[PDB]
Each structure stands twice: as structure tokens, then as C-alpha cells.
Design a protein around this nucleic acid. Structure first.
Ligand SMILES: [Mg+2]
Ligand SMILES: [Mg+2]
Lengths: 218, 110, 119, 122, 56
RNA sequence: GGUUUGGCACCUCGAUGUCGGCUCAUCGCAUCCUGGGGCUGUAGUCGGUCCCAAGGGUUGGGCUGUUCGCCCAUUAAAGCGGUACGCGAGCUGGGUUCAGAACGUCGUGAGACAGUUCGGUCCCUAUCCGUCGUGGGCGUAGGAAAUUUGAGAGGAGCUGUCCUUAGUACGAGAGGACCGGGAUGGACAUACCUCUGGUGUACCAGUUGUCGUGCCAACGGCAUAGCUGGGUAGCUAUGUGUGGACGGGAUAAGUGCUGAAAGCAUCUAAGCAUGAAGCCCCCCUCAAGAUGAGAUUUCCCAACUUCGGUUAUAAGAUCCCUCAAAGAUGAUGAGGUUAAUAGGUUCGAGGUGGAAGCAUGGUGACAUGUGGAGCUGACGAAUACUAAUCGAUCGAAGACUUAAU
């Protein structure tokens, strides 16, 4: 059991040894570090607190997240670590391992292993019904005027209210996502790069998050 | 080539040489590998290269035969280890790079 | 990429603004059009450093067939001026002179106005 | 992709030249089809002679599709036309010949009598 | 289409807790001794964004 | 039962718009399929009937205005019904309920059907509630940044074929299994552009007419982007992958164990087990305005004697500005000279496909060399040349009561 962070950078091609073309995701686990170790003794759950991008030291008169407010620095000086931009946890891990304040290098992973992922989805604005939900559009000609709009909401003069679960134009994008049952292809420790079969919810340079699958079959 | 310099460095290995370099409008005997029935064999396909797109491992071509009155056109990735060998024979002369004007049998590449 | 207007009218508006800015070395505009004409005219001062015939056959497209100028009761054409005069100031420098000045807004339309210059 | 009310050529010794695609057997209301997919067709014309006639209705097995198939090696293929072949759930044809070359992925579906005959498995 | 009811003197006012307008950015001049707005020009005397570079 | 044809005449005549279809669904269960069972005149496969069960699914076309209905071909099945015979401030308007005309007819006649037929105007800029998304203000007994628990709510829930077990069980034979395992697909849902293809209006090239750049050349303007062929980023489905699981807890129908009331028998009253896609738990997501306002780490930490309180400031965030990976606006995020935030420049990818000029060969139209040439929007590093200047605002000094040291 294990899990790391990373960054979607791009997708490519890569071949199996039977000649089967195999698509692939690229991800970068650069500068992963463990920061804090949240026991069940105090909090009520056993987990691992983590950090990914090196950022810089304390402000002087300074400004946004490129640099670091003191409390972050007060958290990263703690375990002999440089301050980090993205912090995330990982429950369901062998907390007996992972001393506070080390690295979670890609070598924990291995070719052939199965995984899930997590990440934000993509930017998408006020999208209509049929693009948000996939409803079916209406007729063009034969004189109509109902091309794309969401249809008749509800029932009648009775059942006056409109039920909550309906389907309407709102934003389509920002959502936590998970994609069970992907596989790993390769682990290049040189560039500290990993490769994941299939494709992941992310934009370029976005956040991506990984862990060992749960539905192995058990 | 660079798309990011992290992709390119790690896809390095799947790349390979022994690629005849050329332009579209080439007759081309592709001596290609096959397995089925557990018979470790090959085939041979011929014809005109319509396309050659893409940089990097994504690179690709598209060939075309007119076997038995029926047009056919196949497109492979370039760097497949499922390919054995290539033989350019002829070499064409054209004022297009993509060749989608190809239809029935007056189509002399010249 | 950016849109002020339709396709054509935008383009000709930019051949116009960029035809100016050299006749006068600075103008007063709304900010957006200044940004776009900045990109253009940056490319043209990058062009007039080279000075080949072909360079004239590329400045010809954007700049106009003529717009007369007189400094000393002289005859110029906004092209002779370019490859003959302007770049010969900024050879030692890259292209990318142009600067922008967020002057103020405008009573009529509420639009921000600026003073883009190459001086 | 081949679907309802789609007209095709043929390949065999039938006495028939083109067909119509009523239904595209599979699942619970498939719309589509590709190489290998058996279908239920009929006959909209005929050359003289031959066993089959107008107004008839029989099955067929698709081959020579115009939006060809992706092989798992990452290679593709494309013909120009669409076509089919007549069949009787021996998964062996009525006909005696096959013009118009064949797409090989039929082999997964265990069709070999028509693959005996086709120039060429491709 | 239409209102059915008269919009009272309260809701007409609560609805207007957002037609206010924001205190614009301001600061004194560096050597024109007066106020103006930020990352902009003075409109006076000789122009002072870092000192004079203009007339208007 | 209150889905039909009906009876009643209680709301509606200063207007409650009706048939059917499109999009949208939502529900009941008297179950159409899957799941589990009892019985059988069930040998097996297939079945008939009854019970529990509504979690999901319940198709394309021909034919009519059509509910209905017949038919074709599929399929595991192609459910019955309620929601103004759902939904017209969301759509249609084919019939029917306007005016015209006509056919059979009834009428002495104007004209009317027990009918038929060609055609025929459908307005509403959303105040409130409701709903989909999203920001302010205050609160959570000092102020901030991060992480996160998760009471609750939502979502997903489908299923075939084939190999094996085994041509075994069964039966004379024809024929032909449970159970379990294994691969493979339909439809559906999510995520993405590396592939396949689409689009791609400041990219590229060819090109017709015409006007202009004083002329040839080479260009520009206009003509649906003037047309035609390609097409980067980006956005995309038919493409690419992925998914429903496994498993456990308590259960209904049913099967039991021990066993009396009732010495026997008895599944039950005392007691114990067992058992479905159902319930729940697990799986994905949201989520402390859960006013029960949580918990953890870290950070800031004065002077004024009004005693209570006041202060400009601290940490921090913002005003302002450059910009997208986000974007209707606001918000989120990358960044702000002690800097690579965007532009430009220099390289590069990819794309287009042999620039111009020059010479040469041509009576010329045109070709060859100079040259994988020139060009290049969004993509990739480097490069402070320009632009984010100097700056102001906001924000604490931790109430009491008990019980603890
Ligand atoms: Mg018809
Ligand atoms: Mg494309």
C-alpha cells in the first residue's frame, strides 16, 4: 500500500513487447516529501501529510504563493524540510513506515502494478443541458423552436414544486475525480518520471494524485 | 525535437533508426511481420505513401494499393517492432504533401 | 489571439494604426488595440533591421502603399522611412521597444485610454 | 458505420448485387456494425440467374468496410467500399467465389471457408 | 412576463445593497503634490509616472 | 382499485386551452426480464401455476392524425397504470372546435350532418416561490494560513454469448444440465486528445474576375473566409481507456434444529441456525451555516491608569497591475523588479511544401539549380528589451461561572 503525487504533463505513445501499441500518461513525482504524520492517537485517524513543489523562504515585504508565509515555514522547518506548495494527505497506508520527514520516491511503485488516480477536471463554463448531462437535442426543421433548451421541467399544477435532482445549465468543470484500475508501465528514476497506462483527469501542469487501488478484487 | 524535454528524454528508447528517409509519392514494398495460428511469418504490401505526419514516436504514414479493383489503404505507426523491413523502389514528384485526390485508375504519380 | 472586431475590419484597422505610430512616433488609443498593434509593429521593427528586398516585400503587405510625409519638405512613404531610418536607431537593441502608458479613462464610453509610443 | 437501411455490394455467386440492412444482430438494440458483425439483410436488385431473387431475406457477414478497423498493434486499414457475403449459419457461405478482398479479423469469429477463397487475407 | 405583486419599499432597498460603487485606487503624486490613481498617469503637470516622459 | 364508457352538476363563463407526438422525467406494484423460492400430470433442455422482491433495464422500422391495433426483423424482456387521460408562460399544430369551396344526403328554401374531403394567424422583456450554478456580510468569546475528520444528502446498481467442468449427470434414443471457473461483447456513465477523423475566419499554398501600388515583376483591397487543397494549439465522438465488482451485517417468501402448550406430532410460543440483483456497510463525489458551527500543526503577541475600553500596527489578506491551467461578472489559480507574470527577440517542435531574386534551358507558357528553401496564431526552453513603478486600505492585545495544577 502506497501513494504519491504528481503532475499530468502529457500523454504519448509507447509500445508493448508483443508490438501492441499502448497509450500512456506522463506524471512527475518530483520533490515529493513527507512533512507530518497524523496519528489516530490525537486526531482519530492514521495518515500521512505530504508535499510536492519546492517553494521559497519567508517573505520580506513579499507576495503570493511563489514565496511562503511564516506558518508554512513554521511547518516545514519542523521536520528538516523545505516549504511546499501542494499539501495533500493519504489515508490507507502503512503508517508504521514513513518516518516524519523523508522522501516518497517513485521506487515504491513498480511496473505491472495497478492503481487509481485523483485530480481536478478541466475548465468549463456555463454549459447547456445537452453538453453538461448529455441530454438529446430537439428537432430542427418541421418548424420547431425547441433546438437545445432543457425541456419541460416537471409535472403539473399538482406536484407544484420542482424537484432538486433536475438538470440545468450550470458549470461543468471543477470536480474531484477518480479513475479506478489503471496500470503502470515504467518507472524512470533518472528524470524522476513515471508512466501510467490510460488517461487521467487533468490539465497540463495540473495536480494529479495517485494511490494503490482498493478494488484489487477484495 | 522537443515537446517538453521530459517526454522526449524518456521516450528515447522506443525510437529507432533503419528508417529510409523520403517524401510522399513513393512506391514502397513494406515487408511486414505477422503472427496468427502460431505461424511466425511475414507479408508484403505495396503502393503509394499518402501521408507522413507527426514528430516523435507518434509519426506515421499511410500507404495505398488497388488490389483486385478494390482500393485499399493502410496506415502504420512508423517505429513499430511489428515491422521488419522497408524498401523504397521509386520516387515521385508532386506539388502536394497530403494526397487525397486519389481515385480511380488514372492516378499516375509520375 | 484577440478580437476587437470582425476579421477583415480588424486587420485593416491594424494596417492603419501600424501605418501610423511611425508617422507620429506615438498615439493615444484604447489599451487593447495598442497591445495588438504593439505585437505587429514589434514584428516590423524586427523586419527593418535585416533590410533585404524580401523584407520590403513583407513590410509591403501590412504597411500601406503610401502615406506621404514631410519633415524637411521631404518626400517619404513610410517604407523608405522604416528601413532607411528607424531600425538604424535600434540596431544595437533588440526589437521590442514599444511601451504603454495607462493614461486615463474617457468620459464618453468609459473606456480606458493610453499612450503607446515607440519613443 | 454500417447500420439500418444501408445499401451494400456483395462478393459471391448469388445472382444478387446489392442488399439492404434491416437489423444488425447483437445485444439489445445495436445501431452499428463493423467487420465480422453478422447482419440480417434483404435484396433490392439482382443480376439474372443465381439462387437468390428479389424480395428475399437472409443473413450476411460484413466485410470490406470503408471505415476500417484498428488492429491492436496500432495499425489501421481502410477500403473504399462496403460489402457483405451471404451465409446460412454454418458460418459457411452459399457462394462458390469471393471477389473483392477480405479483412482478416473474421478469423477470431472462426470463419475459414470464406477465408479459404478470398484474395487476400489482409 | 409580469409581476403579480407590488414590490415594497423594503425589498426595493435590500435589492440595492449592491449598486454601490467602489472607492477607487488613490495615491499622492511623486513630485506633482496631489492625488491620482494607481498604475496610471497623473494628467498633470508634466506627466509623472516615474517623472516626465510626456507633455499631455 | 377509481386507469375506461357512465350518473351527479359541488369550484371555474369579467376565459381552468382540449387529441396525439418531441425533450424531460418521477412514482406505484396488481412483475415483462434478471435474483431467490414452493408445487407439478417437473425424467432432462423447455415448461405451466403460486409466492417474496420495484435495485436497474424495458428496442428499431412499415402502416394511419392516432391512442389502440396489425405486420416485418430483432431481443434476456420488448410490463400495466397515476402525475389537468403528466408537461403548450418549453415545441409542434396533422385531425378536431371559425370564416371559403365541393360530394352523398335531409330539407320546397335559407342551410344542417349519420359523414367525407383540398386549405387555414399558437403573443407573453420572469416580480415571488421552486430549481441549477455561483459571490458578498456576520457568526463559531483574540486574529491568520494550511490539512482533514464526516453526522447527513446525492450517484452507480443492467446483461448476453462462448470454452471448460462434461457430451458427464438424465433418458431407450433423439437430444441434453445444475454448481463453479474462465475469456469475450451489447447498451449505459465518467475522463481525456496520444492515435482515427471532424472543425479551426491573424497559419500555409494554388487560383478566377476586377481596382489599385506611376510600368514589367512581386503584392494588397473586394467578391459567403471570393472558391479549392491541407491543417498547429484548443474544443470534440463514432476514437482512446476505465466502470458496475468482490466481500461482509441484519433480513421477507421458503427450508430447518431442539421442543413443549397438547407425554405423540409440531419450524415456535422460550431458544438456535439458514437464506435474494432487495435493506444496510464497503465503492465515487459534495459536505462543520451539522448554530452540536468540530479536531490537529503552525504563526502573530503593545502602549495608553477611562479598570471596563481606545489606538495605528503585528502575522496575514486585499486595493492596484500583467496573465491563464479558471473565467458571464464576481470568485479559483500562476505572478508583481530581492522577477521569467505576459509580450517581443533567439532557438526548437509540428504544420505548409520548394519563397523572392538571380542565373541557366526555353520563340514563350513554364521547368531545373541556388534550397527539406521561406513562412508560421495559440505548444516547448532560454533571453529582463518593454510592461507588472513609488504606494494606501483592512486586521488582535484574547468576557464571566464553575471544576482542575
Ligand atoms: Mg416509404
Ligand atoms: Mg487533428
Amino acid at each position: 500500500t502506497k501513494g504519491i503525487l504528481g503532475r499530468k504533463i502529457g500523454m504519448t505513445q509507447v509500445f508493448g513487447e508483443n508490438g501492441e501499441l499502448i497509450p500512456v500518461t506522463v506524471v512527475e513525482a518530483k520533490e515529493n516529501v513527507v512533512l507530518q504524520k497524523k496519528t489516530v492517537e490525537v486526531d482519530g485517524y492514521n495518515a500521512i501529510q505530504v508535499g510536492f513543489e519546492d517553494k521559497k523562504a519567508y517573505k520580506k515585504d513579499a507576495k503570493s504563493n511563489k514565496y511562503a508565509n511564516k506558518p508554512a515555514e513554521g511547518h516545514a522547518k519542523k521536520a528538516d524540510a523545505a516549504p511546499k506548495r501542494f499539501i495533500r494527505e493519504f489515508r490507507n497506508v502503512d503508517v508504521d513506515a514513513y518516518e516524519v520527514g523523508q522522501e516518497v520516491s517513485v521506487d515504491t511503485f513498480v511496473a505491472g502494478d495497478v492503481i487509481d488516480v485523483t485530480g481536478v477536471s478541466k475548465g468549463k463554463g456555463f454549459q447547456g443541458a445537452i453538453k453538461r448531462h448529455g441530454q438529446s437535442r430537439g428537432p430542427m426543421s418541421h418548424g420547431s423552436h425547441f433546438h437545445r433548451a432543457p425541456g419541460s421541467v416537471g409535472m403539473a399544477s399538482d406536484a407544484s414544486r420542482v424537484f432538486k435532482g433536475q438538470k440545468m445549465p450550470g458549470r461543468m468543470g471543477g470536480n474531484t475525480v477518480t479513475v479506478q484500475n489503471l496500470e503502470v508501465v515504467q518507472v524512470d528514476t533518472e528524470n524522476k518520471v513515471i508512466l501510467v497506462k490510460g488517461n487521467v483527469p487533468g490539465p497540463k501542469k495540473g495536480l494529479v494524485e495517485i494511490r494503490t487501488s482498493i478494488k484489487k478484487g477484495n | 525535437m522537443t515537446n517538453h524535454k521530459l517526454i522526449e528524454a524518456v521516450t528515447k528508447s522506443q525510437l529507432r533508426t533503419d528508417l529510409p528517409s523520403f517524401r510522399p509519392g513513393d512506391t514502397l514494398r513494406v515487408h511486414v511481420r505477422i503472427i496468427e495460428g502460431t505461424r511466425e511469418r511475414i507479408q508484403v504490401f505495396e503502393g503509394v505513401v499518402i501521408k507522413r505526419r507527426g514528430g516523435g514516436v507518434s509519426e506515421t504514414f499511410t500507404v495505398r494499393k488497388i488490389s483486385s479493383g478494390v482500393g485499399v489503404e493502410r496506415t502504420f505507426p512508423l517505429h513499430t517492432p511489428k515491422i521488419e523491413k522497408i524498401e523504397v523502389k521509386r520516387r515521385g514528384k508532386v506539388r502536394r504533401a497530403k494526397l487525397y485526390y486519389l481515385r480511380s485508375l488514372r492516378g499516375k504519380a509520375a | 489571439r484577440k478580437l476587437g472586431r470582425t476579421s477583415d475590419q480588424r486587420k485593416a484597422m491594424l494596417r492603419d494604426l501600424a501605418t501610423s505610430l511611425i508617422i507620429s512616433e506615438r498615439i493615444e488609443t484604447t489599451e487593447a488595440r495598442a497591445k495588438e498593434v504593439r505585437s505587429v509593429v514589434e514584428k516590423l521593427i524586427t523586419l527593418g533591421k535585416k533590410g533585404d528586398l524580401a523584407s520590403r516585400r513583407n513590410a509591403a503587405k501590412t504597411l500601406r502603399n503610401v502615406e506621404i510625409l514631410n519633415e524637411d519638405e521631404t518626400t517619404q512613404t513610410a517604407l523608405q522611412k522604416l528601413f532607411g531610418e528607424i531600425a538604424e536607431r535600434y540596431t544595437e537593441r533588440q526589437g521590442g521597444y514599444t511601451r504603454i502608458l495607462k493614461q486615463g479613462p474617457r468620459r464618453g464610453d468609459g473606456a480606458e485610454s493610453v499612450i503607446i509610443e515607440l519613443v | 458505420m454500417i447500420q439500418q437501411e444501408t445499401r451494400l455490394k456483395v462478393a459471391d455467386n448469388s445472382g444478387a448485387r446489392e442488399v439492404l440492412t434491416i437489423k444488425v444482430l447483437g445485444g439489445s438494440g445495436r445501431k452499428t456494425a463493423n467487420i465480422g458483425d453478422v447482419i440480417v439483410c434483404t435484396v433490392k436488385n439482382a443480376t439474372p440467374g443465381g439462387v437468390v431473387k428479389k424480395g428475399d431475406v437472409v443473413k450476411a457477414v460484413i466485410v470490406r468496410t470503408k471505415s476500417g478497423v484498428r488492429r491492436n498493434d496500432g495499425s489501421y486499414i481502410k477500403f473504399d467500399e462496403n460489402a457483405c457475403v451471404i451465409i446460412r449459419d454454418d458460418k459457411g457461405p452459399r457462394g462458390t467465389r469471393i471477389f473483392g478482398p477480405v479483412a482478416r479479423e473474421l478469423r477470431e469469429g472462426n470463419f475459414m471457408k470464406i477465408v479459404s477463397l478470398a484474395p487476400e487475407v489482409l | 412576463a409580469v409581476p403579480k405583486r407590488r414590490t415594497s419599499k423594503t425589498r426595493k432597498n435590500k435589492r440595492r445593497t449592491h449598486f454601490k460603487i467602489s472607492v477607487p485606487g488613490m495615491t499622492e503624486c511623486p513630485n506633482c503634490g496631489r492625488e491620482y490613481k494607481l498604475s496610471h498617469r497623473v494628467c498633470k503637470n508634466c506627466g509623472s509616472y516615474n517623472g516626465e516622459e510626456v507633455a499631455a
